[PDB]
Design an enzyme around this catalytic site. Structure first.
Site, PDB file in Angstrom:
ATOM      1  N   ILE A  24     -23.588  12.942  28.595  1.00 45.19           N
ATOM      2  CA  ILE A  24     -22.539  12.074  28.071  1.00 45.19           C
ATOM      3  C   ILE A  24     -22.877  10.592  28.196  1.00 45.19           C
ATOM      4  CG2 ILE A  24     -20.606  13.654  28.331  1.00 45.19           C
ATOM      5  CD1 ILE A  24     -20.128  12.419  31.091  1.00 45.19           C
ATOM      6  N   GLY A  27     -28.598   5.779  30.852  1.00 45.12           N
ATOM      7  CA  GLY A  27     -28.816   4.500  31.500  1.00 45.12           C
ATOM      8  C   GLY A  27     -30.281   4.121  31.548  1.00 45.12           C
ATOM      9  N   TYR A  29     -31.973   3.711  34.285  1.00 44.75           N
ATOM     10  CA  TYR A  29     -32.590   4.402  35.414  1.00 44.75           C
ATOM     11  C   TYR A  29     -31.960   5.768  35.689  1.00 44.75           C
ATOM     12  CZ  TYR A  29     -34.831  -0.076  36.538  1.00 44.75           C
ATOM     13  OH  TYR A  29     -35.576  -1.233  36.495  1.00 44.75           O
ATOM     14  N   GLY A  30     -31.492   6.440  34.642  1.00 41.72           N
ATOM     15  CA  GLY A  30     -30.940   7.773  34.797  1.00 41.72           C
ATOM     16  C   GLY A  30     -29.873   8.145  33.785  1.00 41.72           C
ATOM     17  N   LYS A  48     -24.324  11.828  37.762  1.00 49.54           N
ATOM     18  CA  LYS A  48     -25.182  10.690  37.460  1.00 49.54           C
ATOM     19  C   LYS A  48     -26.534  10.822  38.156  1.00 49.54           C
ATOM     20  CE  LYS A  48     -25.127   5.609  37.493  1.00 49.54           C
ATOM     21  NZ  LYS A  48     -24.309   4.411  37.829  1.00 49.54           N
ATOM     22  N   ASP A 146     -20.400  -6.771  36.948  1.00 52.29           N
ATOM     23  CA  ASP A 146     -20.795  -6.104  35.709  1.00 52.29           C
ATOM     24  C   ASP A 146     -19.603  -5.536  34.936  1.00 52.29           C
ATOM     25  OD1 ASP A 146     -22.797  -5.488  33.900  1.00 52.29           O
ATOM     26  OD2 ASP A 146     -23.208  -3.516  34.770  1.00 52.29           O
TER      27      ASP A 146
HETATM   28  N1  LIG Z   1     -17.311   9.702  35.433  1.00 47.95           N
HETATM   29  C1  LIG Z   1     -17.731   9.519  34.180  1.00 47.95           C
HETATM   30  N2  LIG Z   1     -17.136  10.221  33.188  1.00 47.95           N
HETATM   31  C2  LIG Z   1     -17.552  10.040  31.931  1.00 47.95           C
HETATM   32  N3  LIG Z   1     -18.515   9.235  31.475  1.00 47.95           N
HETATM   33  C3  LIG Z   1     -19.085   8.555  32.476  1.00 47.95           C
HETATM   34  C4  LIG Z   1     -18.769   8.630  33.818  1.00 47.95           C
HETATM   35  N4  LIG Z   1     -19.566   7.783  34.571  1.00 47.95           N
HETATM   36  C5  LIG Z   1     -20.340   7.220  33.670  1.00 47.95           C
HETATM   37  N5  LIG Z   1     -20.108   7.638  32.389  1.00 47.95           N
HETATM   38  C6  LIG Z   1     -20.796   7.198  31.180  1.00 47.95           C
HETATM   39  O1  LIG Z   1     -22.136   6.883  31.516  1.00 47.95           O
HETATM   40  C7  LIG Z   1     -22.443   5.535  31.107  1.00 47.95           C
HETATM   41  C8  LIG Z   1     -23.447   4.926  32.054  1.00 47.95           C
HETATM   42  O2  LIG Z   1     -22.975   5.088  33.408  1.00 47.95           O
HETATM   43  P1  LIG Z   1     -23.063   3.919  34.474  1.00 47.95           P
HETATM   44  O3  LIG Z   1     -22.352   4.309  35.772  1.00 47.95           O
HETATM   45  O4  LIG Z   1     -22.507   2.695  33.854  1.00 47.95           O
HETATM   46  O5  LIG Z   1     -24.608   3.760  34.846  1.00 47.95           O
HETATM   47  P2  LIG Z   1     -25.480   2.571  34.326  1.00 47.95           P
HETATM   48  O6  LIG Z   1     -24.867   1.977  33.025  1.00 47.95           O
HETATM   49  O7  LIG Z   1     -26.854   3.071  34.020  1.00 47.95           O
HETATM   50  N6  LIG Z   1     -25.539   1.362  35.494  1.00 47.95           N
HETATM   51  P3  LIG Z   1     -26.468   1.762  36.857  1.00 47.95           P
HETATM   52  O8  LIG Z   1     -25.545   1.761  38.135  1.00 47.95           O
HETATM   53  O9  LIG Z   1     -27.604   0.677  37.051  1.00 47.95           O
HETATM   54  O10 LIG Z   1     -27.096   3.112  36.710  1.00 47.95           O
HETATM   55  C9  LIG Z   1     -21.091   4.837  31.045  1.00 47.95           C
HETATM   56  O11 LIG Z   1     -21.128   3.728  30.153  1.00 47.95           O
HETATM   57  C10 LIG Z   1     -20.176   5.951  30.536  1.00 47.95           C
HETATM   58  O12 LIG Z   1     -20.212   6.054  29.116  1.00 47.95           O
HETATM   59 MG   LIG Z   2     -22.838   0.905  33.072  1.00 47.77          MG
END
Ligand SMILES: Nc1ncnc2c1ncn2[C@@H]1O[C@H](COP(=O)(O)OP(=O)(O)NP(=O)(O)O)[C@@H](O)[C@H]1O
Ligand SMILES: [Mg+2]
Length: 333
Positions: A24, A27, A29-30, A48, A146
């Site tokens: 869904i 990122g 880094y994952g 995640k 952020d």
């Molecule tokens: N609990 C959740 N339920 C649904 N979608 C989620 C959830 N957590 C994250 N996402 C989706 O995943 C995307 C990326 O997650 P995010 O926690 O923002 O990691 P990131 O953008 O890579 N920042 P980082 O902490 O450096 O990894 C978000 O923009 C959401 O669209």
């Molecule tokens: Mg994010």
């Protein structure tokens, strides 16, 4: 690492509980995966993944450790919750781990991109929930740093949850220019002010409010200087005393040599919006953070009057040492 089946096999070696369904989120880094917990009555849950590139740099690994700590630190309805921390039992295999959170339907970046119609009542509930969440985070002595639509999770119930504490800060660092999304950075950040406050999160909400009211991202800069140009072009040239109050010496110098831009017409930018919405938007997007509306004041603003109803301090303290600390956070489950 890539295919769903490969991720499933990887998760099973950590905990057999989680059944993967679909990715869904993606990122730098994952990836983020929609999973069902077979012991919790097949309830949906978000997972995640943190990949190996995080554990190559000490700075990156310290950021993810703080993020998990913060997620566990908060227990609130408007902040995304932490369900589990899956880590490899063998330190020789620890080159990845999973963050397990509550699931949300989507996020605001998405919602806005779909171009879906949102009433003022929808926006009011979104904004208040976001502010209420920020008040809790800020009271814990933490700055989110952020605040972007992608980091704001929402349901069809219009319930809201703030996520991504990957860049969270204590209530002075050197901001990087190598970024994919700088459109939500406050002017004090853009103008290289080393020490900032929690007002940078308010700026992010203003940008989000500007888009919710019916618009694409207001300040679409391609670089740092261009970001400042995009901000000033809209909100207008600040007073001399305000310019001297924010920014490095070079940033202030550039802003003064720039041609005069008047405060743009919010009424023309949003013909349908209420005067209450346009005032909150105006005050949220004030150049000088000291004259910018605070979270408390924003929650008490007349735009959110039908919603307003009259936390503990987060303690901040090699790569191997970080890995051990992450497993310690895993033990707590
Ligand atoms: N609990 C959740 N339920 C649904 N979608 C989620 C959830 N957590 C994250 N996402 C989706 O995943 C995307 C990326 O997650 P995010 O926690 O923002 O990691 P990131 O953008 O890579 N920042 P980082 O902490 O450096 O990894 C978000 O923009 C959401 O669209
Ligand atoms: Mg994010």
């Amino acid at each position: 690492t890539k295919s769903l089946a490969e991720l499933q096999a990887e998760v099973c070696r950590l905990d057999d509980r989680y059944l993967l369904e679909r990715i869904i989120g993606a990122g730098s880094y994952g990836v983020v995966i929609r999973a069902r917990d077979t012991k919790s009555d097949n309830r949906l849950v978000a997972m995640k993944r943190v990949n190996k590139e995080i554990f190559e740099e000490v700075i990156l690994a310290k950021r993810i450790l703080r993020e998990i700590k913060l997620l566990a630190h908060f227990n609130d309805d408007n902040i995304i919750g932490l369900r589990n921390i899956l880590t490899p039992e063998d330190p020789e295999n620890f080159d990845h781990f999973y963050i397990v959170m509550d699931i949300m339907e989507t996020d605001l970046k998405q919602v806005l991109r779909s171009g879906q119609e949102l009433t003022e009542a929808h926006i009011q509930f979104f904004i208040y929930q976001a502010l209420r969440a920020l008040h809790i985070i800020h009271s814990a002595g933490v700055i989110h740093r952020d605040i972007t639509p992608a980091n704001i999770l929402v349901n069809t119930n219009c319930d809201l949850k703030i996520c991504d504490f990957g860049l969270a800060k204590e209530e002075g660092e050197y901001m990087t220019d190598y970024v994919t999304m700088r459109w939500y950075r406050a002017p004090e950040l853009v103008m290289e002010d080393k020490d900032y406050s929690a007002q940078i999160d308010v700026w992010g909400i203003g940008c989000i409010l500007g888009e919710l009211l019916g618009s694409r991202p207001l300040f679409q800069g391609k670089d740092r200087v261009n970001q400042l140009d995009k901000i000033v072009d809209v909100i207008g040239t600040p007073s001399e005393e305000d310019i001297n109050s924010v920014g490095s010496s070079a940033a202030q110098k550039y802003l003064k040599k720039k041609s005069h831009r008047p405060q743009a017409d919010w009424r023309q930018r949003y013909p349908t919006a209420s005067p209450e919405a346009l005032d909150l938007l105006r005050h949220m997007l004030v150049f000088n953070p000291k004259r910018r509306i605070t979270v408390l004041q924003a929650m008490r603003h007349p735009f959110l009057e039908q919603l307003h109803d009259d936390y503990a301090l987060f303690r901040f303290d090699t790569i191997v040492d970080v890995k051990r600390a992450i497993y310690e956070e895993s033990v707590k489950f």
